[PDB]
Amino acid sequence: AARWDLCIDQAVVFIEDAIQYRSINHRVDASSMWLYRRYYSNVCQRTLSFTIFLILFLAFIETPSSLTSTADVRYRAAPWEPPCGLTESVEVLCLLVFAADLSVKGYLFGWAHFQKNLWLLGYLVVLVVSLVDWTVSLSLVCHEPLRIRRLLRPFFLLQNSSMMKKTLKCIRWSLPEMASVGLLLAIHLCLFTMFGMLLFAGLTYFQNLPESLTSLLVLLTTANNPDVMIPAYSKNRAYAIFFIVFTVIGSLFLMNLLTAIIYSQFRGYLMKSLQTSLFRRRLGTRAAFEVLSSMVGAVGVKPQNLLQVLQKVQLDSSHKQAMMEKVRSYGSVLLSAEEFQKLFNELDRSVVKEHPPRPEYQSPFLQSAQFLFGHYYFDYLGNLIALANLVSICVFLVLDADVLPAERDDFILGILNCVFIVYYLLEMLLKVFALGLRGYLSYPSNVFDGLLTVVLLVLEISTLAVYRLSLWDMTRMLNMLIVFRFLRIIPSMKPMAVVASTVLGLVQNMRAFGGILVVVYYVFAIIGINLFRGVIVALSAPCGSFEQLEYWANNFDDFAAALVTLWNLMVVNNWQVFLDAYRRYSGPWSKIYFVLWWLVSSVIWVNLFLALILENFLHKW
């Protein structure tokens, strides 16, 4: 009856879930399995992965606008303030796509599963309180600067991906073991300020208690390492032993225990979670076996239906072709459950595909050429001339600088460059014969090479059309692309190839743990906008201050300058100066914001991002 195909559609959903590591917890009906295949297709999810990009992009356009060519305070125009209809209009279109998504994700699962899963409760309460905020931002007037719904926008990014859920749970089970050091770092920082204030009371860095605390917090990351030593080391030579002992205990040892203790528990709890992701793979092969053995209602499956199921599944070609021969390889056997999971080990075989070389209408001139050009020396001799073009730019660049920069001689550089553009033209025209245009475009290193020979050919005739011999600007862009062209020797050489190829593999694991950085920037910038928006005005400074250096571009006026001021605080150089500005301009209690940013960004996250990659880099050798 109708139980034949219903067992089949119960089997296609399980084996496709067995590929992409999703939990087998559904409300399996006839109609829902039509809905399930459409939601996890690459046409519906590529709009959900597109609209999350749009709402985070909407911070570039809102009323503290960032569409200005500069970012100074001394000279910048007014940014184009948009009319306040179109700002909030594109928000509500991108919220009525998540209003469909929560209803689909909730209908496909049980209501009992809904009440136990705390993400979907959090996906609910965030969606409602944003919808109340969209009313009140329209209802009174479009003049409220404080937009609370802008803070909740990274929650839609964390809800989508299934690995940023895992590593956020993973950080929570490592911070309780941090407290044996975070207490130990506090007593070390608190004893040295009282011991520091008594020694130099018989320099202006220690004439106060909150200054001497904030001057040893800066020394803890060595951001002012000679400057805090000088007026006490010049007085007596033995006072340098106070600051030598402090940086050895605190900066070199205690700050590095905070890295190693957090990571060694981060490695333990993560591998337990990634072990769970492998468990759902073997359950999908297991759950497919139960319904297909129930098609009879020995202990096995009839191979006649097994042609039909792997025909319908979404896969590659050779992954489908090897499976379709092996199900044809048997007759009337009853494929057991261990034999069923003997079958699906094919999915971990990396495959290679290449196109055949092209012949011509003639024999003898054809065969003599591809014996030479395919020997991987023709793109080795092309590497040497790429170095020959690069040194001529360097020879040009060290003789003009001894003269005024008005470029007395440009003709010599032009008549050597145009020869090399003819040379780069011959590499494209010859190799397309040696491999065929479908084969020459198949290798991705030649796509990077073949594209740049086109743009150099376009630009060289362009400057020769106007100037038969902006002309300094036109020959400037020509030489920049040649230095960009020199990157081709990185995949070509033998030792540089494997270090490039492994990092290209780790981009499929950078997608998860790099996505948290977008969450941490987005929270601190909007809070950073709503605290220091217009607190810097520019209307003879001391030589070390925020004003003597021309640091006016590191404001917090708009979302594009907030993501650069927060960048120069992640690298921890010279952040004694921002604590001098944003204390003198916006009160002494602003230092809790920057100290919290130094704890989240440059201590916890950056080390745990690089330890996660550079372990997985060397593990893959």
Place this chain on the structure above:
Amino acid sequence: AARWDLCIDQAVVFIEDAIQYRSINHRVDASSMWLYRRYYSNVCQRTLSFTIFLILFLAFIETPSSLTSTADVRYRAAPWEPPCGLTESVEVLCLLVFAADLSVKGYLFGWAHFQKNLWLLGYLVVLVVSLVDWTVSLSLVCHEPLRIRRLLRPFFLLQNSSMMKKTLKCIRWSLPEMASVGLLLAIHLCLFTMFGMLLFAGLTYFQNLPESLTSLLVLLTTANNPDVMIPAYSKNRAYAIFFIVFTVIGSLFLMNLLTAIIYSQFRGYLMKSLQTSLFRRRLGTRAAFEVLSSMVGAVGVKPQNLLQVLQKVQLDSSHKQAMMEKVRSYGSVLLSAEEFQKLFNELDRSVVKEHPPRPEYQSPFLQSAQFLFGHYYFDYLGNLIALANLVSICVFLVLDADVLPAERDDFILGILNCVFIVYYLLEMLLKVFALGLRGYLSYPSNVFDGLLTVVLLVLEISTLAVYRLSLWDMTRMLNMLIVFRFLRIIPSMKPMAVVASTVLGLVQNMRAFGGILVVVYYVFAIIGINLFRGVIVALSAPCGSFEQLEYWANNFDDFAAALVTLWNLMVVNNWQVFLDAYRRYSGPWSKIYFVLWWLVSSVIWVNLFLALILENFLHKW
């Protein structure tokens, strides 16, 4: 005959070599085994370990002398130049102790073993060329500044210790696998200077090729991270993406691959060498079995001689007592070789020793007290009052600063401090009754506590004798010791105890890999003296230069200021300024010295020192 005791003295030397991991490769005679026990005793080797400290200490006294209270150039006196007899006289006494050491180490081993061992050849040629240099430094006159024998002085430190030999071999088998990145870091640094010079040619950091190279080398370690961005980011907002991409590739990723690749091969080759050190331990038990089984000339040993051999060996008490009962535990058994190495597994048992509490002549008042004081709460309530004394200093220190620092009120702090000195007096006088003076001095935490109660008692009556109520200076040293006293809560608390106790265990492994830092400082300081000795003279500066900041104390005039200028270069903050000074003062070719110092100190050594400790810290949990 005389073969009885000769087999015995052949057995004492092997089992003592089985304890301290020395190779069983000797010229075993009758007379040499008298010499061998004296050379590896703790009375001869504690002079060899003392005279190596002396020659490195002699750099503090030689003719660029470092006996000056300050280290400026603006104001310092002439250092006391010693008469040139006594400088070179103490050197030759410390060279005629190594002239005995090479002859003893060579006579005890074979001449065939001498020719194959390259350390003893290096110990020879260094010893001779220093002896020629001691003549020529005396023979013409004591006026040659260049002392080549001062460079060779760390070789006597590397020759003595048997683990700095191992890790120096270990670094050599990791640098060949560095070259896949050191080439990759060079092309990345060389492409960005030509691409950088063309973009800003349509700021003064890029108007030259050697300046733009040395300005991106500084950016590679983020020592000038906002300062190099400013004049191009204020011009146009999109130019910040040039410096964001550069620090992500180079500073955060490529500089960290240089740490992880070197360490992951440093971990591999070191554990192979430490495995070899365990191999000599089981050979010493094996080589002792062969001679004692040859005392018969079943398959075993007679236990009658085995009382005599472990009686003569140098060991501890319980390590000797447990062995002396087990050899007495058997009768006429023939102890086999596996039974012989069944015996010597006792040497890996950490032992505890404690002294009994002391009673008095009376029963009832005695028993009521030690039920209370030994409950580890009496030194918990002592921790709270130590926090109560510390907060009163903090309450004092935040109210004087709002006034002028002439200390209007000191009487209030004095009449609370003297109460706490009586309180700290009662902790010593009561606990010495509760445990006995031999037991109270047995625990090392009470030695640190009991000593500071004496010095506070000495100082408190001292300021009260002169001043019945320098007096600000006398009450200053009193409050400093109280903050020093607060360190006692670190071993007392539960979570802080295990993090303190493990690092105290790692000092017996810090002795090896920390000794290389003394070699790297000693080479670069003497070279640093002989290149920039008197090249800084002080006779309105730009606001960012070496002269506006008062950096005059970071000279290279003497060996004590060289070890501080090299310290502020190991921490890599503000070393753009030294490259501005020591290029403008001593030629542009001095930058090879500082760049080589940044490669050896703050890239290779510091990371490999901390990765070696903080792995072994967390491995011991």
